[PDB]
């Protein structure tokens, strides 16, 4: 089908997706957009719930604008702001290490981004470099690290009672193993702490080039998650974060948060801004990838 909604032309498949993602164009405004498609026959629908989480988030810094949700042939479609490459794309472009300055510019932003999500009574639960995208130059947000992919989010404040969700265990594992928190591996209900811990793992991935549990395989997914969690538990923070004392402090702090506890986001930002200033860095958005040829759908 040629169109989604009144005004969005459906274009080519984009990204490296299987038809899940297309370029689109708002014919009414002469603007490109991203079109996410999900078959109506899906045995595990996620797109409509994702749209509802975007409505709960509302308009925010580093959150893509969402323009439409509705049918498109035999698909449900969500039309959203077209962003730039992901941090994983950019990491590859930068030979799979980022400088401390780039990691800190990312980290300072992403602590705030997670604070925003948490302020809207949601936990994110899908931290990975693929889900953080820079903007496009055309919208003056190419410097801003955005967060996408809210299909795995959850409301952590129950809306009627206004109580934090209860602690429980035996939660099935499905996420991304590489970044997930130790408590996620143990089958615990995720909470605010776990989003911040997964961010810490991702920051160390960027700094080191890899994480020491990244290569582990097993005959079953469950066994693989187990081995990865075992390695996370067996790798001292002082070792993982050798040469990055503030990252060690960050990770120890988030690992030690209680399930119900509100993180001190101010404290975590200050760890990193104090470090940033002490190193003489200037917060000028000159990330490692500036000056390189970025992948673009057009
Ligand atoms: C490297 O090629 C591309 C670079 C940037 C790009 N922009 C996007 N903007 C979005 N809002 C996107 C998404 O919502 C999205 C949707 C699905 C998806 O599946 C892996 C990945 C990203 S991709 C899409 C493709
Ligand atoms: Cl445009
Ligand atoms: Cl920010
Ligand atoms: Cl991995
Ligand atoms: Cl600098
Ligand atoms: Mg915006
Ligand atoms: Mg995903």
137: how many CB neighbours lie within 10 A of its CB? Answer: 12
Q: What is the resolution of this structure in A?
A: 1.3
Q: Is 17 annotated as a binding residue?
A: yes
Count of domains in the chain?
2
Q: What is the CA radius of gyration of the chain?
A: 20
Look up the CATH number of the domain holding residue 36: 3.30.200.20
Domain that holds residue 199: 84-298
Look up the CATH number of the domain holding residue 133: 1.10.510.10
Same domain, 199 and 275: yes
Same domain, 172 and 239: yes
Give yes or no: 126 in active site: yes
Reduced DSSP (H G I as helix, E B as strand, rest coil) percent helix, strand, coil of the chain, to 5: 35, 15, 45
Same domain, 210 and 265: yes
Q: Is 205 exposed, middle or buried (0-12, 13-18, 19+ CB in 10 A)?
A: buried
Same domain, 142 and 187: yes
For a ligand 1 pocket test, name from 90, 126, 148, 293 the mutation site with the most ligand atoms within 8 angstroms of its C-beta: 148
Q: Is 21 helix (H, G, I), strand (E, B) or coil?
A: strand
CA nearest 93: which of 104, 85, 103? 85
Query: Half-sphere exposure of 207 toward its Cβ, with a 13 Å CA cutoff?
Result: 22
Q: Which residues contact 178 (CB under 8 A, 6 or more apart)?
A: 128, 201, 205, 211, 213, 214, 228
Q: Is 14 annotated as a binding residue?
A: yes
Same domain, 109 and 63: no
> Which of 65, 83, 101 finishes a domain?
83
Ligand 1: does its nearest atom lie under 6 Å from the Cβ of 20?
yes
Same domain, 51 and 135: no
The Cα 252–Cα 244 span in angstroms is 13
């Amino acid at each position: 089908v040629l169109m989604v909604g009144p005004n969005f032309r459906v274009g080519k498949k984009i990204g490296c997706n299987f038809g899940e993602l297309r370029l689109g164009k708002n014919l009414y405004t002469n603007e490109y957009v991203a079109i996410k498609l999900e078959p109506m026959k899906s045995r595990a629908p996620q797109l409509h719930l994702e749209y509802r989480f975007y409505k709960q988030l509302g308009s925010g810094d580093g959150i893509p604008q969402v323009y439409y949700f509705g049918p498109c042939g035999k698909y449900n479609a969500m039309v959203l702001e077209l962003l730039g490459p992901s941090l994983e794309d950019l990491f590859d472009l930068c030979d799979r290490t980022f400088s401390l300055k780039t990691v800190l510019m990312i980290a300072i932003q992403l602590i705030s981004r997670m604070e925003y999500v948490h302020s809207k009574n949601l936990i994110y639960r899908d931290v990975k470099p693929e889900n953080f995208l820079i903007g496009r130059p055309g919208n003056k947000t190419q410097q801003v690290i955005h967060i996408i992919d809210f299909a795995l989010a959850k409301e952590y404040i129950d809306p009627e009672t206004k109580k934090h969700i209860p602690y429980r265990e035996h939660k099935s594992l499905t996420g991304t193993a590489r970044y997930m928190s130790i408590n996620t591996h143990l089958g615990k209900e995720q909470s605010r702490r776990d989003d911040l811990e997964a961010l810490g793992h991702m920051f160390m991935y960027f700094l080191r080039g890899s994480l020491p549990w990244q290569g582990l395989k097993a005959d079953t997914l469950k066994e693989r998650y187990q081995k990865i969690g075992d390695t996370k538990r067996a790798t001292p923070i002082e070792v993982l974060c050798e040469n990055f004392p503030e990252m060690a402090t960050y990770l120890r702090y988030v690992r030690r948060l209680d399930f119900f506890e509100k993180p001190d986001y101010d404290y975590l930002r200050k760890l990193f801004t104090d470090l940033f200033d002490r190193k003489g860095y200037m917060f000028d958005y000159e990330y490692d990838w500036i000056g390189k040829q970025l992948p673009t759908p057009v």
